[PDB]
Subunit: 260 residues, 4 copies
Amino acid sequence: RTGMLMEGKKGVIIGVANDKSLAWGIAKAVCAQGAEVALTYLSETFKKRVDPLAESLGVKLTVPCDVSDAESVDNMFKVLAEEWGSLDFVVHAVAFSDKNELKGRYVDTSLGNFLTSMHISCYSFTYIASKAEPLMTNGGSILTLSYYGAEKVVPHYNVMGVCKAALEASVKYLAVDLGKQQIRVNAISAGPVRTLASSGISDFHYILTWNKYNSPLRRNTTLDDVGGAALYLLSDLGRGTTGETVHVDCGYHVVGMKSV
Amino acid sequence: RTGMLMEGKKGVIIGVANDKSLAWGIAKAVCAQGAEVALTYLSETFKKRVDPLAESLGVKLTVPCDVSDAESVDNMFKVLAEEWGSLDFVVHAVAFSDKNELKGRYVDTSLGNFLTSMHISCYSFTYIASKAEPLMTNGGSILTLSYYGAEKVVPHYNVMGVCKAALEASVKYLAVDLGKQQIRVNAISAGPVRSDFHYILTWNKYNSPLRRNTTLDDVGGAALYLLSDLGRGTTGETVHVDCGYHVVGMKSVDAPDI
Amino acid sequence: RTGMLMEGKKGVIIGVANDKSLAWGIAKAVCAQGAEVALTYLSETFKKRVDPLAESLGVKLTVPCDVSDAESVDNMFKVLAEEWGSLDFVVHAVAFSDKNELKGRYVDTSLGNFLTSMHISCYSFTYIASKAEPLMTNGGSILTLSYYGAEKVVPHYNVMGVCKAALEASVKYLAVDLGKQQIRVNAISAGPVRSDFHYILTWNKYNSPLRRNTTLDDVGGAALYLLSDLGRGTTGETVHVDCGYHVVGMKSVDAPDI
Amino acid sequence: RTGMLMEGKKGVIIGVANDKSLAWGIAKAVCAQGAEVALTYLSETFKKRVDPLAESLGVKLTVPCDVSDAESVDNMFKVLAEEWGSLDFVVHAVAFSDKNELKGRYVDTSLGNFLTSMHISCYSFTYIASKAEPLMTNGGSILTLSYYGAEKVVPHYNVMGVCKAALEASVKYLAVDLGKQQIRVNAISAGPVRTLASSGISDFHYILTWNKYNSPLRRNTTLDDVGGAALYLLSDLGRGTTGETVHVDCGYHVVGMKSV
């Protein structure tokens, strides 16, 4: 632990499956600042994957949560209510889309993929926000993750661009609903980060390298970058910001053509 | 008929339910400019309701279509293929959401309503565009309708805001896909057209730069831009046709609160 | 003459320097649709250059105007008042910036260039709109030109990006002011039109959804929308006429880097 | 002092004339986190106003700076170079416009007001950024202030809306220029804050109350809100964000009509 920005703040982080993800980068930053964190895992099968990550962060409460199953989500919040009685933050780092449809054209998106992607990548945040609300009695902060594909067309993203635009819109509506209770709702629009030594996807190598060479900072977004932004939005530093999508992308969102 | 801007252009307008519809305003405008139009109607049960609208427009082709049903959409495009052989334009002016959840809070949105609203209000446009594409062999123009609730919170617009934001994003992705065939894809973000609706209309009247509400004719005008050769150069765009409402950052100091 | 969309509309087009100008494309389009146009020229010294352009358009009124000089602008509007008695439209298609500072870094921009660029490229539109207003007694439409460099960094656009962002903002404030008189105020954000310029053109060709460059005709089309009755319902807007470039978030994977 | 987020970071804050301003709120937050700050003052006349503010923050270096005078700006940076040798941050909290023109219509803006407003409210940031650049040898962060009037028409703002749109655009261009050296450039778009017990301006009372009752958080932006956002962007937490305008406005920017 390196500071106290999150000292006394309890929160659940949804989406930590390995030590390479944005969700991990957020968990590490808030734990390093004194937060008390619960991590979710998809099902009994994956508990073994999450335990060591949890142990290494000092997390003592791990809970099953499959965000596509309302009962799973309800149970998870019941556990947090029982263990803690209240909640200060929620981090939603969950997305899903059919990988085979990403390789093709958006216009050929299937209804099943569209609805499943929308459910998991967008609606789940709304449902989670509704369940968090009654536990967040001393205000709080609810955070999700987005990406520039919500705003502009980028490769290998297709229906997720549409889901993330929906998400970013939902953040605004939720902020209004939850703001009277001083609950902030925000998104981080993260630049691409390498999670895999080889994804085997040329578009992903392309996305990463294009961002690296053409972003104002001339590097890729790191987990620590995203951690720092999450610390802003989830601690008291971020009290006056809600409904916002903050770009944590080394500046890429300002580029209209190419670095020269 | 008032002009020839759409002369020789064939297209299908989806969403003409009555003579108050945005779809109706667009139909009237493109028909007045020489377009050959097909109007969809939901099913035979409701055909009697579209008939007199078709007749007053001079439309001679009406075709059943439930935009929530892939087979229905496929058959509608097969009809157009058989009757016309090619297609110049599509107007998608259809939205659905649970009326009661609109009256509540967005945070209380149910899954069923979210998905149903998203299917009809957003996905149907993408599917329809997928079926239109093979018919649009001399380029063309595909147009949908949105609202400022996609960009900013409008009370009691709730999940439709989220659906329209998805729709406007889909316009961009579709523009990239269909642009290879010279097909443009655009949206009109319309102001409310002259309880909850009344309040919104009144609010837009008092606070829009032009100090009036959007009309069907305003929307028909913008549709004529985007659907005719005038608009060949614009794709992926959402054009505000809202008397300027979109630029206002606060209630006008000169307007009463209501 | 190809149509009557602008029949009976009188307006002044500022910025017609040659037959490659955006101003020229708009002039040709509104003249082809029946508009009565006045063209400005900078001073008598350069009148010989506008003459044949005016003549080929059928324009019979040309008037000196240096947009950096308040008295020049005033006298131009006094001429139009005397000749016409009222005005329906204004097109402002004029920009200036130091060509050498464009080749450098934005951070090295000098004060003199910043202010001069801002005066000519941004303030002149506001002043011109102030002088047009009293003449626009049956509503009307005031139109300026912008570029995507207002919204995103385009290399070597530097201070013009900052000026165009100011211009697009001014469009919104002006829409609120002039909307009371039913005058619309809008911008077209144009793609580059078919060294540095070539690179930009090529880049837009490879990466725009429609896989082609913007043309003068595309821009004339959009101007016809906004300046005619078709566009009565839109104000404060910046419409992208750029073959969809504005929706692209990254170089196309199918395009070569250049 | 309450923490260490800015420990070892040296920076100049331009625009602290009293203890009610956004610039003061920023100075207080970064000083409270261990920053070493220089405050500027307009001229010898106002040194007396700034000294006590400086004393109370623990600031030891105050320097004249009139941002409309290039020599004044150059001298100020010379002083910082001599005293410190390098710089970690700059905060630009300076705007000017003719108050009499604010009361009327934007369309009636005068050329003199337009150019003076643009010079002080927009160009000065660019010039300041150019002077900061060679001193910012271990990266850094340059921050300015903006307001929703840049994006949307709001009352009693007129040409400042145009200047702030220009500013926000300049932030993007500057971020590209300075980003190779890992200098971030960003803006905070602050909600209105009451600085005066009575401004005597009805539009200002209106703006404040409209923001208070219609923002998602149902309160006005505070100096501390803006301080917290400045801490994000100016400390290491903000390393991955550049070219951004972050809304610190209690959510007001998401409102399309009115709270209900």
